[PDB]
Design a protein around this ligand. Structure first.
Ligand SMILES: [Cl-]
Ligand SMILES: [Cl-]
Lengths: 660, 660
């Protein structure tokens, strides 16, 4: 009944700095204008105003309906015009936002949609700093909504208008409360029927409907309640079961409007000594971090790109994700729902880390806008079963303008919006700083063995902190190491992090030792690898090219899994057979005697070097096969590893050459 | 006992516009400095001088041996220095070159190689213009060669020092004339023995040997003639058999130097009416072109990039390739040797096409340099069996400085170097121009149905040219149409080539019509798709991003095969099963009525639309399955095709949305 029309095709664009006429060029949404300058490594890429114009014919039959323009993302600040009259402004690059254009168009005519987008710097719109790209543009989809004059309202913070809250969840019973925004845009009072039907496919599981009166040009909220006995729980990747919940408005029979949403029922708690308990059973959060960009296109992502990023994490055995450092797309939360991957999602309250300036500036506009951004985050995505914590900052400092007061304010805003999920944060503060003690959970970013030290520093630090504050729920927000797939060398030696040489073997070593450190500590409720993918950061000058943070387990184009990916796949994915030699891309070696390493989830593998066996071996606790003192021969070599397990015979091999 | 040592590791690099004392950064060859600016679509990318400096310890134990630095490719003009003294210059960006440093180095001590590289514009070093990128730098490997003082010389145009000329080849008998460059670098005359041993695996097919004395500080060119009764012919992709031919130098019973080269025996001819005939059988040349670049790295390619490029053509059923527009890597020629893919390779005498300026400036240095580039091509790559024609130019114009005489000179030079291979060229000249009649075979670049006109124009023009000049050997050297994989619509509609809109469905239509035209004309000895892959051309402003020529059948990162790829693969690859729905990336459609099209090499296949069967169908002569008047649903559809040929059931499917 209700209509949702994609508006991405054929816009006109120009930069306000192109001040002459006839300078517009065709673009097609999604779109950023920084996919070339920023990705090329230019730190001063284009940050300012871009102008999108669309011609949209408003049909006559649409008069008497209600028309909305929903934007799923526009970085950073957007001003919307209909036939060149301002209708609204939205400040924030990552929440969806909406405007009703029912009273603003000429029915039966072409009309003009004009979106003036600014991604230039501000001190009053988070994020203010960050180790990533602030791609400017309409980089997510744009939709025309047409509904009945009486509808389930899409206007409240661009939420769906249906909000599904879970309490009393057990293996035996669950209670769901359903908050519905209903809007009467007619001049007449209406007697409507409101109904909720929760379904398993096409089988009704529960159902309640309600008749009530609503005056003209008025909206009110309705909160229905229903129950499910012996509910089918959403249980992570073991069984990511999903009800669909349909809320309908009815009038004289026949549906007049409909909204459907996912319902995944789960209970869980974060235990200071046991970690994360999902539906009564402990669950390691084997996590990675993910940014929303890609090679060549920046953050103008299409559906298939989200799907592919999800598939690669699923393949590696990921069961948790931190979506850094901002609200991300509905269809990615969808995929995490459907795969059973637990989600940490946060507002863009990002501090400087090792860089300059601040993530917090004590401006009324900044503080206020931040609260609206956190309110957008929760109201737009709270229905997703995969979301399990709400994150409030990444790497703020207490020096200069101190955000501790404001963070406490944000924490309270989160609880007003959602009591059912803990808050968390990603800190790089000494443990004594108050801001580590506000959120329900806390976590630190740690690079022991990359930005200085050795991996053993990590377990000591975490052990000490867990001892001094026994009630903290500690996790590793970030840990990782740079790696170019074209940087190879025989020996493990710690590269300079800020230089043009990130040899792949050190990333491998780093994650091996670090996962060992994490896996020995059950008090950590999760760990999150920085990062799943290389991602654009235009100011970086390191690795094999500028403009890239190269700590991904997979390359920026999603083409090449680095060695470390297969290390995590050996450990985390016990379903697909894995047998993978490390260092296949080290193809020109200077030593004759080497240490060979493979990763497997098989019980046993045997190494062969020019057909000459070097023995069977079993992986250690963390899936690592290792043969020291393997003599290669001058010139060409072939290195093959083989494993048999009943009918399952696996093989991996590569070639290489030794010079001197 | 000969030594070959890669020098790609850790060079110091700085531009000469960086004037200050410590501005050097680390690079690792292969290297270009235009990986970021040119591929970003900046038309004025850095064209000028950069400087590479390498410190090399010259072993004490190397005195008494000879030492060579061989560069496989430095774009454009190189100046090599040892210990900051000048030792030579090379003008040309695409041919190997070598410099002996035996007498320039201080033995037992650390020595410094400096390479000053210039890709700034010149009017006297082809190529002067071109629809592609002039990536500066040492973008190919650098080798230090260490040989006995008496050696098989690597000095003559950086050749291998062994030329295998096939002077008479048949199914019964083959004569091969071997020319070996020998050099006595010592100051005493020397009695050496020369050996050539032609092997099939470990088996000696023929051997030939001779003794002589050579004087000190002296070179001479030895010729040995070999026969092979009933030779095993390199027969393209049906049987790309390769003999190994190893050349040894011997002194007092011991081998002191060796160079091994590939030998594939074949005979062929180009018939004006019959096309290309390989070892007696007519072979249609199913061909594509290929530039030597790739996303993110530019032309600084590694071996795996070459290998993947070649696997992609092989998968598609390519059997011929035009390497445009310049001499390419030995590594890649070796792949075509092994795959059986016939190779057209050309010097970079490239004209302006639809752009400005000139391929040819009548300067004496331009002319002599061109002759040296053509000698480098033939002498370096002559041994590769896959190479079958030599190209002399691409889209020169007779207006202004007329190159026609100079082309006659070039043709003469080619024949001085190789009487076993015909010469060809790629013209955009009306057939009446004399420059179409110099080379033995000719070919035109035609874009009928992209740069104006319809595809059927192509056959009309071909047939007419064929009829007027019945002794010309005509091929189609380019034909193509751009496509973005992100640009989709419902109707076939000719886009504007220079505009920001290249819908994928036109390229599909274009190649299906032009293959039909080409496939019907046996007088075309070959046809070459422009292009196998999207490639860098900074000046370009079309498709979905600037700086890209998007006529590739496969995208610039080699991740996504466009629809047309599968059209060729269904026609050309008959060994792997193909069942491929066209249009899968057109996910949002505006019209419920559709024509569903699929490519297959299977006998028949059944279309299902939302489980509803639209009956079985058969491919056409060009492997196209088509179902007319297919009726889709509003909202989500699913489209699936199935083929069974027991024992083989194949399936392909995709999801789109209809939204009027
Ligand atoms: Cl801060
Ligand atoms: Cl010219």
């Amino acid at each position: 009944q209700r209509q949702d029309i994609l508006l991405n095709d054929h816009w006109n664009f120009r930069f306000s700095h192109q001040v002459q006429k006839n300078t517009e060029v065709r673009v097609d949404l999604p779109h950023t204008w920084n996919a070339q300058d920023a990705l090329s490594g230019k730190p001063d890429y284009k940050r300012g105003i871009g102008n999108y114009e669309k011609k949209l014919f408003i049909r006559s039959e649409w008069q008497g309906k209600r028309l909305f323009l929903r934007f799923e993302g526009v970085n950073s600040v957007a001003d919307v015009f209909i036939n060149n009259l301002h209708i609204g402004e939205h400040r924030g690059g990552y929440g969806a936002f909406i405007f009703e254009i029912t009273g603003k168009v000429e029915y039966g005519k072409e009309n003009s949609i004009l979106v003036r987008v600014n991604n230039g710097e501000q001190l009053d719109v988070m994020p203010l700093v960050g180790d990533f790209n602030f791609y400017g543009g309409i980089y997510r989809d744009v939709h025309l909504l047409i509904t009945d004059e009486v509808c389930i309202s899409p206007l409240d913070h661009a939420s769906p208008g249906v909000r599904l809250t879970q309490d009393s969840v057990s293996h035996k019973y669950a209670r769901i409360e359903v908050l519905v925004e209903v809007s009467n845009g007619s001049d007449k009072a209406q007697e409507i029927e409101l109904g909720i039907c929760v379904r398993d496919g096409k089988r009704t599981v529960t159902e309640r409907n309600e008749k009530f009166s609503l005056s003209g040009n008025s909206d009110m909220q309705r909160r229905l309640v229903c129950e499910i006995k012996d509910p089918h729980l959403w249980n992570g990747r073991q069984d990511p079961f999903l009800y669909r919940a349909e809320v309908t408005l009815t009038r004289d029979g026949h549906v007049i409007d409909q909204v459907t949403q996912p319902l995944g029922l789960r209970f869980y708690r974060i235990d200071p000594n046991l970690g994360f308990i999902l539906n009564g059973k402990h669950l390691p959060l084997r996590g990675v971090c993910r940014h929303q960009d890609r090679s060549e296109i920046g953050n103008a992502l299409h559906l298939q790109h989200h799907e592919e990023d999800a598939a690669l994490m699923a393949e590696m055995g990921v069961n948790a994700v931190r979506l850094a450092h901002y609200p991300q797309a509905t269809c990615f939360y969808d995929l995490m729902d459907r795969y059973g991957i637990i989600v940490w999602t946060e507002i863009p309250f990002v501090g400087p880390g090792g860089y300059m300036d601040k993530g917090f500036v004590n401006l009324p506009a900044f503080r206020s806008n931040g609260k609206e951004q956190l309110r957008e985050l929760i109201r737009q995505h709270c229905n997703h079963p995969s979301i399990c914590v709400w994150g409030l900052f990444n790497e703020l400092t207490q020096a200069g303008d101190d955000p501790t007061e404001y963070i406490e304010e944000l924490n309270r805003v989160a609880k007003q919006e959602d009591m059912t999920r803990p808050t968390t944060a990603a800190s790089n503060r000494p443990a004594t700083e108050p801001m580590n003690f506000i959120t329900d959970a806390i976590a630190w970013n740690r690079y022991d063995g990359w930005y200085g030290g050795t991996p053993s520093d990590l377990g000591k630090w975490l052990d000490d902190t867990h001892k001094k504050y026994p009630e903290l729920r500690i996790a590793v927000s970030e840990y990782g190491a740079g790696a170019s797939i074209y940087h190879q060398q025989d020996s493990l030696k710690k590269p300079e992090p800020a230089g043009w040489w990130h040899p792949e073997n050190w990333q491998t070593y780093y994650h091996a030792e670090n996962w060992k450190t994490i896996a020995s500590r059950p008090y950590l409720w999760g760990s999150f690898v920085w990062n799943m993918f290389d991602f654009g950061a235009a100011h970086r000058t390191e690795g094999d090219r500028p403009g890239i943070n190269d700590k991904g387990l997979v390359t920026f184009d999603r083409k090449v899994r680095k060695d470390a990916f297969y290390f995590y796949k050996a450990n985390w994915n016990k379903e697909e057979p894995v047998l993978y030699l490390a260092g296949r891309r080290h193809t020109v070696r200077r030593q004759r005697m080497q240490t060979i390493v493979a990763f497997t989830n098989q019980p046993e593998a045997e190494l062969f070097v020019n057909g000459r066996s070097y023995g069977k071996a079993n992986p250690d606790e963390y899936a690592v096969l290792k043969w020291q003192n393997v003599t290669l021969q001058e010139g060409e070599n072939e290195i093959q590893v083989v494993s048999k397990n009943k009918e399952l015979t696996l093989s991996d091999s590569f070639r290489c050459r030794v010079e001197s």
